[PDB]
């Protein structure tokens, strides 16, 4: 997260880290056995880390639980990035507490201008590389589909939305993928892609979760 | 053009996935951050795979 702030320990209790010997993506806990992330975060052997603040130190609230299933959307397109969503089943159920909690799925899509909370352990620099120990947070608005298509001609599908600031300085960045965009208490987005980080005229692009609620619920219930 | 001589490509996706690329200026396979999508060919999952494909380019 570029241009954000330190969230504070366990203030975003639905945020998880996906670990393959190191943090490589985020995710969002949606019930005690299931996480939502990005399809481009698929790896075999994922370990989900819950209750984290400092991802480099064991601090006392962590639960480390292997993925038992990592299910990429059946229509994910790895060239257009359409349908960039994955569901991860936990091999055992997480213990829910004040620091490990689920986030609600949306009942309707959000409108342009809605302010949301984006979080992750990704790079904090727009030119160079700095990865944080603790979780970072950013408040940013959803942008109109027209502005998103103007920023990225020919690239925005009905399953994507832009969020951020056209002047630059505030964005998701490498290591944030798969993590949450939460608006009024609902998981509306998944960190997906952009063009650089926090550059002028290049807002972040997010998977539009409200289009997938039926698929999420049925896939979870079938697995 | 030899794909082993192209600079490493993070791409547009926002993951922080460690991959290997052949660095011809150093004569070594080296690590870099891949964002998870739209990989170019100088992008390997292990040093051994990189060395096999690109060593000596
Ligand atoms: Ca920790």
Short mmCIF file of C-alpha atoms and ligand atoms in Angstrom, two decimals:
data_model
loop_
_atom_site.label_atom_id
_atom_site.label_comp_id
_atom_site.label_asym_id
_atom_site.label_seq_id
_atom_site.Cartn_x
_atom_site.Cartn_y
_atom_site.Cartn_z
CA UNK A 1 0.00 0.00 0.00
CA UNK A 2 1.43 3.35 -1.12
CA UNK A 3 0.35 6.52 0.59
CA UNK A 4 -1.49 4.76 3.40
CA UNK A 5 -1.10 4.46 7.16
CA UNK A 6 -0.39 1.85 9.81
CA UNK A 7 -3.75 0.18 10.48
CA UNK A 8 -2.99 -0.82 14.05
CA UNK A 9 -2.67 -4.39 15.25
CA UNK A 10 -5.65 -6.61 14.44
CA UNK A 11 -7.87 -3.63 13.43
CA UNK A 12 -8.61 -5.39 10.12
CA UNK A 13 -9.42 -8.86 11.55
CA UNK A 14 -10.58 -10.36 8.21
CA UNK A 15 -7.23 -9.64 6.51
CA UNK A 16 -5.08 -12.75 5.98
CA UNK A 17 -1.63 -13.33 4.53
CA UNK A 18 -0.97 -16.07 1.99
CA UNK A 19 2.42 -17.63 2.66
CA UNK A 20 4.61 -19.90 0.53
CA UNK A 21 7.69 -19.61 2.71
CA UNK A 22 7.20 -15.81 2.54
CA UNK A 23 4.22 -13.48 2.16
CA UNK A 24 3.12 -13.28 -1.49
CA UNK A 25 -0.57 -12.24 -1.47
CA UNK A 26 -3.38 -11.18 0.81
CA UNK A 27 -6.90 -12.53 1.25
CA UNK A 28 -10.13 -11.95 3.15
CA UNK A 29 -11.74 -14.35 5.63
CA UNK A 30 -15.41 -14.85 4.79
CA UNK A 31 -16.26 -17.66 7.24
CA UNK A 32 -14.27 -19.88 9.59
CA UNK A 33 -13.23 -22.20 6.74
CA UNK A 34 -12.98 -20.00 3.64
CA UNK A 35 -10.88 -17.14 2.28
CA UNK A 36 -11.42 -15.02 -0.86
CA UNK A 37 -8.31 -13.98 -2.84
CA UNK A 38 -7.24 -13.34 -6.46
CA UNK A 39 -6.98 -16.09 -9.06
CA UNK A 40 -3.45 -14.89 -9.96
CA UNK A 41 -2.47 -15.71 -6.37
CA UNK A 42 -2.95 -19.42 -7.03
CA UNK A 43 -0.05 -21.60 -5.78
CA UNK A 44 0.05 -25.12 -4.48
CA UNK A 45 1.03 -25.45 -0.84
CA UNK A 46 -0.44 -22.20 0.44
CA UNK A 47 -0.43 -21.54 4.17
CA UNK A 48 -2.97 -18.99 5.36
CA UNK A 49 -1.84 -16.78 8.22
CA UNK A 50 -4.63 -15.23 10.29
CA UNK A 51 -4.47 -12.77 13.15
CA UNK A 52 -1.26 -11.17 11.83
CA UNK A 53 0.07 -7.68 12.36
CA UNK A 54 3.87 -7.91 12.12
CA UNK A 55 4.26 -10.61 9.44
CA UNK A 56 7.97 -11.03 10.27
CA UNK A 57 7.56 -11.86 14.00
CA UNK A 58 5.40 -14.25 16.06
CA UNK A 59 3.33 -11.85 18.27
CA UNK A 60 0.67 -13.97 19.96
CA UNK A 61 -2.55 -13.85 18.00
CA UNK A 62 -1.55 -15.86 14.96
CA UNK A 63 -3.19 -18.91 13.47
CA UNK A 64 -1.31 -20.66 10.64
CA UNK A 65 -3.58 -22.99 8.69
CA UNK A 66 -2.83 -24.83 5.47
CA UNK A 67 -5.07 -24.50 2.44
CA UNK A 68 -6.92 -27.70 1.71
CA UNK A 69 -8.43 -26.40 -1.55
CA UNK A 70 -7.46 -23.42 -3.68
CA UNK A 71 -10.22 -22.98 -6.24
CA UNK A 72 -9.68 -20.49 -9.11
CA UNK A 73 -12.77 -19.14 -10.87
CA UNK A 74 -13.49 -21.50 -13.80
CA UNK A 75 -13.55 -18.57 -16.24
CA UNK A 76 -10.39 -16.82 -15.02
CA UNK A 77 -8.55 -15.50 -18.06
CA UNK A 78 -4.83 -15.11 -17.36
CA UNK A 79 -4.37 -12.69 -20.28
CA UNK A 80 -7.33 -10.30 -19.83
CA UNK A 81 -7.45 -10.84 -16.04
CA UNK A 82 -11.22 -11.23 -16.20
CA UNK A 83 -12.73 -13.22 -13.29
CA UNK A 84 -9.70 -12.70 -11.02
CA UNK A 85 -11.07 -14.47 -7.96
CA UNK A 86 -10.11 -17.61 -5.99
CA UNK A 87 -11.60 -19.35 -2.97
CA UNK A 88 -9.31 -21.04 -0.47
CA UNK A 89 -10.65 -23.63 1.95
CA UNK A 90 -8.79 -23.95 5.26
CA UNK A 91 -7.75 -27.48 6.23
CA UNK A 92 -9.18 -26.82 9.70
CA UNK A 93 -11.58 -24.13 10.79
CA UNK A 94 -10.09 -20.95 12.16
CA UNK A 95 -10.92 -20.01 15.73
CA UNK A 96 -12.85 -16.78 15.47
CA UNK A 97 -12.12 -14.08 18.01
CA UNK A 98 -11.71 -10.32 18.13
CA UNK A 99 -8.54 -10.55 16.01
CA UNK A 100 -9.71 -13.20 13.52
CA UNK A 101 -13.14 -12.40 12.11
CA UNK A 102 -15.05 -12.74 8.86
CA UNK A 103 -16.16 -9.96 6.50
CA UNK A 104 -19.65 -9.90 4.98
CA UNK A 105 -20.22 -10.32 1.26
CA UNK A 106 -22.15 -7.53 -0.47
CA UNK A 107 -25.88 -7.53 -1.06
CA UNK A 108 -25.56 -4.98 -3.87
CA UNK A 109 -22.77 -3.33 -5.84
CA UNK A 110 -21.22 -0.06 -4.64
CA UNK A 111 -21.47 3.24 -6.50
CA UNK A 112 -18.77 5.59 -7.78
CA UNK A 113 -17.54 7.78 -4.95
CA UNK A 114 -18.12 5.24 -2.16
CA UNK A 115 -15.15 5.38 0.25
CA UNK A 116 -13.54 2.05 1.00
CA UNK A 117 -10.72 0.58 3.08
CA UNK A 118 -7.91 -1.22 1.23
CA UNK A 119 -5.25 -3.08 3.23
CA UNK A 120 -2.16 -5.23 2.83
CA UNK A 121 1.55 -5.91 3.35
CA UNK A 122 2.60 -4.87 -0.14
CA UNK A 123 5.25 -2.42 -1.28
CA UNK A 124 4.86 1.10 0.18
CA UNK A 125 6.93 2.93 -2.45
CA UNK A 126 5.82 4.23 -5.83
CA UNK A 127 9.46 4.16 -7.13
CA UNK A 128 11.58 1.56 -5.38
CA UNK A 129 10.90 -1.19 -2.89
CA UNK A 130 9.99 -1.14 0.78
CA UNK A 131 7.93 -3.91 2.33
CA UNK A 132 6.36 -3.22 5.72
CA UNK A 133 6.44 -5.35 8.81
CA UNK A 134 2.94 -4.32 9.91
CA UNK A 135 -0.36 -4.09 8.07
CA UNK A 136 -1.03 -0.89 6.11
CA UNK A 137 -4.37 0.71 5.31
CA UNK A 138 -5.68 3.16 2.73
CA UNK A 139 -9.00 4.95 2.36
CA UNK A 140 -9.90 5.38 -1.29
CA UNK A 141 -13.04 5.91 -3.39
CA UNK A 142 -14.52 3.72 -6.05
CA UNK A 143 -14.26 5.44 -9.45
CA UNK A 144 -16.75 5.49 -12.27
CA UNK A 145 -16.60 2.85 -14.97
CA UNK A 146 -16.22 5.63 -17.56
CA UNK A 147 -13.15 7.01 -15.80
CA UNK A 148 -11.72 3.51 -15.34
CA UNK A 149 -12.14 2.75 -19.04
CA UNK A 150 -10.58 6.07 -19.97
CA UNK A 151 -7.57 5.23 -17.80
CA UNK A 152 -7.20 1.72 -19.28
CA UNK A 153 -8.69 1.66 -22.79
CA UNK A 154 -9.80 -1.77 -23.92
CA UNK A 155 -8.86 -3.43 -20.64
CA UNK A 156 -11.72 -3.01 -18.16
CA UNK A 157 -14.38 -5.72 -18.09
CA UNK A 158 -17.73 -5.75 -16.30
CA UNK A 159 -16.01 -7.69 -13.47
CA UNK A 160 -13.47 -4.95 -12.67
CA UNK A 161 -13.60 -1.53 -11.07
CA UNK A 162 -11.08 1.20 -10.43
CA UNK A 163 -10.46 2.80 -7.03
CA UNK A 164 -8.02 5.46 -5.94
CA UNK A 165 -6.85 8.99 -6.75
CA UNK A 166 -6.10 10.23 -10.25
CA UNK A 167 -3.48 12.67 -8.98
CA UNK A 168 -1.30 9.76 -7.82
CA UNK A 169 0.33 8.96 -4.51
CA UNK A 170 -2.17 6.43 -3.09
CA UNK A 171 -2.61 2.89 -4.39
CA UNK A 172 -2.23 -0.85 -3.89
CA UNK A 173 1.10 -2.34 -4.91
CA UNK A 174 3.00 -5.62 -5.23
CA UNK A 175 2.15 -7.85 -2.29
CA UNK A 176 -1.36 -6.48 -1.79
CA UNK A 177 -3.02 -8.71 -4.42
CA UNK A 178 -5.88 -10.83 -3.21
CA UNK A 179 -6.59 -8.58 -0.27
CA UNK A 180 -9.73 -6.67 0.63
CA UNK A 181 -11.49 -3.55 -0.55
CA UNK A 182 -14.21 -3.08 2.12
CA UNK A 183 -16.94 -0.46 1.76
CA UNK A 184 -19.53 0.09 4.49
CA UNK A 185 -18.64 -3.25 6.02
CA UNK A 186 -18.93 -5.32 2.84
CA UNK A 187 -16.18 -6.94 0.76
CA UNK A 188 -16.66 -5.13 -2.58
CA UNK A 189 -13.25 -5.70 -4.14
CA UNK A 190 -10.14 -7.87 -4.39
CA UNK A 191 -6.77 -6.23 -5.15
CA UNK A 192 -5.98 -7.28 -8.74
CA UNK A 193 -3.82 -5.11 -11.04
CA UNK A 194 -2.68 -1.64 -11.99
CA UNK A 195 -0.02 0.16 -14.02
CA UNK A 196 2.90 0.83 -11.74
CA UNK A 197 1.87 1.90 -8.25
CA UNK A 198 0.32 5.21 -7.27
CA UNK A 199 1.08 6.88 -10.60
CA UNK A 200 -0.93 9.82 -11.88
CA UNK A 201 -3.90 8.81 -14.07
CA UNK A 202 -3.36 5.08 -13.28
CA UNK A 203 -5.73 4.06 -10.46
CA UNK A 204 -5.80 0.54 -9.09
CA UNK A 205 -8.06 -2.12 -10.62
CA UNK A 206 -10.06 -4.47 -8.40
CA UNK A 207 -12.19 -7.57 -8.94
CA UNK A 208 -15.87 -6.64 -8.59
CA UNK A 209 -16.99 -9.04 -5.83
CA UNK A 210 -20.69 -8.14 -6.04
CA UNK A 211 -20.85 -9.99 -9.38
CA UNK A 212 -19.65 -13.21 -7.74
CA UNK A 213 -21.74 -13.54 -4.58
CA UNK A 214 -23.94 -16.37 -5.90
CA UNK A 215 -20.89 -18.21 -7.24
CA UNK A 216 -19.00 -17.77 -3.97
CA UNK A 217 -21.86 -19.07 -1.84
CA UNK A 218 -22.58 -22.08 -4.10
CA UNK A 219 -18.91 -22.99 -4.55
CA UNK A 220 -18.25 -22.87 -0.82
CA UNK A 221 -21.32 -24.99 -0.16
CA UNK A 222 -20.25 -27.58 -2.79
CA UNK A 223 -16.76 -28.12 -1.38
CA UNK B 1 16.28 -11.82 -29.83
CA UNK B 2 17.08 -13.94 -26.93
CA UNK B 3 14.44 -13.92 -24.24
CA UNK B 4 17.17 -14.70 -21.66
CA UNK B 5 18.57 -11.19 -22.31
CA UNK B 6 15.38 -9.32 -21.60
CA UNK B 7 15.08 -7.46 -18.29
CA UNK B 8 12.81 -9.09 -15.71
CA UNK B 9 9.11 -8.22 -15.99
CA UNK B 10 7.03 -7.74 -12.85
CA UNK B 11 3.86 -7.02 -14.82
CA UNK B 12 0.64 -5.37 -13.75
CA UNK B 13 -0.72 -7.75 -11.13
CA UNK B 14 -0.16 -6.92 -7.44
CA UNK B 15 1.34 -10.11 -5.98
CA UNK B 16 4.84 -10.32 -4.51
CA UNK B 17 5.96 -13.70 -5.94
CA UNK B 18 9.70 -14.45 -6.00
CA UNK B 19 10.90 -15.72 -9.39
CA UNK B 20 14.25 -16.12 -11.11
CA UNK B 21 15.57 -14.37 -14.21
CA UNK B 22 18.86 -14.73 -16.07
CA UNK B 23 20.96 -11.61 -15.58
CA UNK B 24 23.38 -11.61 -18.49
CA UNK B 25 25.35 -8.64 -17.09
CA UNK B 26 26.21 -10.73 -14.01
CA UNK B 27 26.19 -14.13 -15.63
CA UNK B 28 23.83 -15.41 -12.93
CA UNK B 29 20.22 -16.37 -12.37
CA UNK B 30 18.88 -13.86 -9.86
CA UNK B 31 15.66 -13.30 -7.95
CA UNK B 32 13.05 -10.64 -8.73
CA UNK B 33 9.42 -9.82 -7.85
CA UNK B 34 6.78 -11.12 -10.24
CA UNK B 35 3.30 -9.63 -9.80
CA UNK B 36 1.51 -12.88 -10.76
CA UNK B 37 0.26 -12.33 -14.30
CA UNK B 38 1.51 -11.77 -17.86
CA UNK B 39 4.93 -13.31 -17.31
CA UNK B 40 7.54 -13.00 -19.96
CA UNK B 41 9.84 -15.98 -20.64
CA UNK B 42 12.85 -14.86 -18.52
CA UNK B 43 10.85 -15.88 -15.45
CA UNK B 44 11.48 -19.21 -13.71
CA UNK B 45 10.20 -20.94 -10.62
CA UNK B 46 13.65 -22.16 -9.52
CA UNK B 47 17.28 -21.30 -10.03
CA UNK B 48 17.82 -24.75 -11.53
CA UNK B 49 15.15 -24.14 -14.20
CA UNK B 50 16.66 -20.73 -15.03
CA UNK B 51 20.18 -22.15 -15.29
CA UNK B 52 19.05 -25.00 -17.52
CA UNK B 53 17.16 -22.72 -19.92
CA UNK B 54 19.34 -19.58 -19.93
CA UNK B 55 22.78 -20.38 -18.46
CA UNK B 56 25.40 -18.97 -20.82
CA UNK B 57 23.14 -16.74 -22.85
CA1 LIG C 1 3.16 -12.08 13.40
#
